[PDB]
Symmetry: C2
Subunit: 87 residues, 2 copies
């Protein structure tokens, strides 16, 4: 439950394409947000979109708890930025 | 909130120590807490503790935003999980 803002400027996503072996292409797409991390000042964080799921419209979003995950040696983590209209 | 709690049996830490592959010394203390990330039940999570830092004491907690950093391409990561008391 973090403030995320997408300003109109940020509405289109941004690419970083690619490939690995057995069936593993890295052809990455990213969109950007301003995240207020407590501070009076916003941070440009990046959102990595997963296949078939799209760039968020402009507006105000909260970070959704499924955005967090528990890793290999038991640490909690942002796996991917997950947003909701929630307010 | 990222709802967190340390029960009586969890109010303490374990030390793991050995050596880093840049041949550097570690002596890391770890503690378990229950995190409510949604799901239907409490997921168990590992707080790594800072040098000096006493293991937190039983109770209700919430995650403090100082736990989230940003680097490289606007990449958000949890740095340390710093919990503060509930309200």
């Amino acid at each position: 439950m973090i403030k995320v803002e997408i300003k109109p400027s940020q509405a289109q996503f941004t690419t970083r394409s690619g490939v690995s072996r057995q069936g593993k292409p890295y052809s990455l797409n990213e969109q950007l947000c301003y995240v207020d991390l407590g501070n009076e000042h916003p941070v440009l964080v990046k959102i990595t979109l997963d296949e078939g799921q799209p760039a968020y419209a402009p507006g105000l979003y909260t970070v959704h708890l499924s955005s967090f995950k528990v890793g290999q040696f038991g640490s909690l983590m942002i796996d991917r930025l997950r947003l909701v209209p929630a307010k």
